[PDB]
RNA sequence: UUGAGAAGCUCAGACGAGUAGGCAGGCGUGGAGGUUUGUGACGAAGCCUUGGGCGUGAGCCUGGGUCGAACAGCCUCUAGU
RNA sequence: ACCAUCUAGUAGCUGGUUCCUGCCGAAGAGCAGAAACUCAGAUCAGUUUUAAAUGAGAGUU
RNA sequence: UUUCAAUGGCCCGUCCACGGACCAAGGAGUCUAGCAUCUAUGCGAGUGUUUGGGUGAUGAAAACCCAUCCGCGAGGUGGGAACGCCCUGGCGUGCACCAUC
RNA sequence: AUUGGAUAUGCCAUAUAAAGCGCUUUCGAAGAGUCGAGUUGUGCAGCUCUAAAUGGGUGGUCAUCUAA
């Protein structure tokens, strides 16, 4: 699939996406490097997406691919996306950042929607804490300085907007903003710390765990 | 690769086959140039999103 | 830094085949018109006959 | 790939040869300038061509 | 009182004895360093090749 | 007076053709003769091994090639050089042995008079 | 080689100059004004710096956060006289092949001055070192 | 507001002799590589001209006459310029 | 005496030495620039008052 | 363009003198080796393929490749660029460079 | 059409010969008006003198060559 997902023909690329649903829905443990390889193919499936109508249907399709993944490696799937997007973000050109901005917006909402889905089966705070832990050793990791801040400003901008969309009526009490607070409290890059609060739209109404 | 800024350096200031040197202005004989002038904005080679 | 990962291959009849070749790293080498011009200026002299 | 090698791996058909490294990483400088990283901390720009 | 003028002609040869020993030595030491300073080829590269 | 090198590549080619001519004449056998390994004669280079001129008479006696038949199979004989140490002897006796290992000498026609 | 622009004809150094012209004037930072000034300098005015120097300069008091990226507008050469290389994070114009391999394999990471700009557009938490001009 | 050949565009103010001497940018000629889907027997080049035009200039463009086979712009190279 | 090479014999000297515009600019160690640094939080002055005024950013290897 | 008018206008170069009858064409800082500085380029504790060898089926005096050599090279104080934290300034870190032990 | 060096084969082949390498209770010749020395002219040449046999030459007693 990996070579086919980055083909020079959209028809070839699309047929690998439809075949990827069966591959991801497997009930077996996927190693982390296996998802690293897959997301490099999926990155170039969207890197080569041509029209804005298509490249926004594709982002919906890729985000809609998260619930297909097995529950045990669903967190690995998303954590590998945010790691494959951090390292490749700087090499994107100015005319391709706006299709990947929408891709991260669709994957941020997929994370919140997956928390919503799992909040019915198990208590919400465990689900959020598990997802928050994913953010900790991912984009919001303080130990690595290689992660771009252009993505983190994006996540701050869209964090509450996607949260409101996932729960139109009212969101419960949880540590929705934990990755941001722990980052501004301990980030080693002052530009991130000084301007992340200015961009995050954190509301105190629902943050008390 | 399409660096789109490395391209303009190579064409905009080194050699383009489409360039007419003028006393007051350079031109393009490129068919896709909107203005017919050689400059960074109207270069069809150097602008990957062009109309 | 990101670039097209693979390259298509054609047959005699000009039809695209299914095999693709991963783009070699030489196509990601820096494109240096000033360097190429200087090295060309010298390499272009090395078949000159004396007069 | 055997003739020219990589920037990290050597050429097979040239001894000890590695492809040159570049001074910049992403050559799109307008992508650097107009990024959210740099446009989020710059002081607000004055006019373009200014009035007399 | 110092040495013979032949040994003055021989002092340079004594330096010479170690002249190309050290360049042959510093050469293969450079090859040793090369084998030690090797970048692993990033198993995310061969996804398409 | 200036010596100008405009015939540097024309010399290179001529020497290749002389090699090609030499092979065409004796093509089943090497274009160069075999040489011994000798140690250069100074405190600066005595740790190198380089090609010598020909093999000594002690080296050929020990290998088994008489000084007469040595030249006929392309083994040069240096009568001037000698073996002051056993290392040089055994290094070059083995060299002759390896060369003879790979040698295919083609039989010649020998006069066979009818009578006794 | 002068005060107004570089005398190099390399396009990528001009592209670096084009980026740091922006930072120099659209930020209050004195780091971005220095980098632009040092990008106009000649080869001899940008002497190389070494791995051993960079580790030595950023040591002793290295009990601090040490997130500080080391920045040189110049070449980071290698020093094979030192055996163990610490964990460093250096943004330089150039790294030699063995300097870059040592910083990566035993330690942290190597940057370019445009990769630094996206990390520290104001030069925050940076050690802007220089090479010795002793010739 | 479109006015990024960022080597671009735009605002302001001051200043202007010049030998030796220093610095910079340009004009021209013969040949070289690339380029202009370049020019040419419906006339190339050259030459003539109280025809016209451009540039502070070096110079360039052009109309007409004459002519009859080749020539030029642009980017680099070079020199018996 | 003549002829051919050496011979492009010997130069403190004579005469000559080919396009444009711009900028800086003397002398008649000093005078002129270039890089590098150190800088209104600095020192100066073809000046004057007294026993500070005024102009200028000042320097250095 | 020619001419007229009013106004201004003493032959050019060269060093009084010396060259100048006119016109066309030719006619003078060149090439090469050494050295020094400066700038650019590549690599960088290294660096330099072109003595030579390999090789080159479209021209083969090129381009490409490279064995063995060989050259050249081989701790505190103050000020201080830059940075972080503060409530102009203070505190910490302090490259290059210059006086200091 | 002129020839190269090879190959296959025929006929001749004065071999009662000629070699290579094993050994030794046997021998082992080696270049002179030259080398060398003294003195002049441009190592060489002139002129005067003129050798030796583990000698002679040339290098650092040793090494290494073996001229005419």
UniProtKB/Swiss-Prot annotation, chain B:
It comes from the Eukaryota. It is found in: Cytoplasm; Nucleus. Belongs to the MAK16 family. This is Protein mak16. The chain holds residues 1 to 51 of 302 of the full protein.
Swiss-Prot record, chain D:
Coiled coil: none annotated. It is found in: Cytoplasm. Component of the large ribosomal subunit (LSU). Mature yeast ribosomes consist of a small (40S) and a large (60S) subunit. The 40S small subunit contains 1 molecule of ribosomal RNA (18S rRNA) and at least 33 different proteins. The large 60S subunit contains 3 rRNA molecules (25S, 5.8S and 5S rRNA) and at least 46 different proteins. uL4 is associated with the polypeptide exit tunnel. uL4 interacts with its chaperone ACL4 and the nuclear import receptor KAP104. The eukaryote-specific C-terminal extension harbors a nuclear import signal and delivers the ACL4-uL4/RPL4 complex to the pre-ribosome, triggering uL4 release from ACL4 and incorporation into the 60S ribosomal subunit. There are 2 genes for uL4 in S.pombe. Belongs to the universal ribosomal protein uL4 family. This is Large ribosomal subunit protein uL4B. It comes from Schizosaccharomyces pombe (strain 972 / ATCC 24843). The lineage of its organism: Eukaryota, Fungi, Dikarya, Ascomycota, Taphrinomycotina. The gene is rpl401. The chain holds residues 261 to 312 of 363 of the full protein.
From Swiss-Prot, chain E:
It comes from the Eukaryota. It is found in: Nucleus, Nucleolus; Cytoplasm. Required for biogenesis of the 60S ribosomal subunit. Belongs to the BRX1 family. This is Ribosome biogenesis protein brx1. It comes from Schizosaccharomyces pombe (strain 972 / ATCC 24843) (Fission yeast). The gene is brx1. The chain holds residues 247 to 295 of 295 of the full protein.
UniProtKB/Swiss-Prot annotation, chain F:
Keywords: Cytoplasm, Phosphoprotein, Ribonucleoprotein, Ribosomal protein. GO terms for biological process: cytoplasmic translation. One of its GO terms (cellular component) is cytosol. It is found in: Cytoplasm. The keyword Phosphoprotein applies. GO terms for molecular function: RNA binding; structural constituent of ribosome. Component of the large ribosomal subunit (LSU). Mature yeast ribosomes consist of a small (40S) and a large (60S) subunit. The 40S small subunit contains 1 molecule of ribosomal RNA (18S rRNA) and at least 33 different proteins. The large 60S subunit contains 3 rRNA molecules (25S, 5.8S and 5S rRNA) and at least 46 different proteins. Belongs to the eukaryotic ribosomal protein eL13 family. This is Large ribosomal subunit protein eL13.
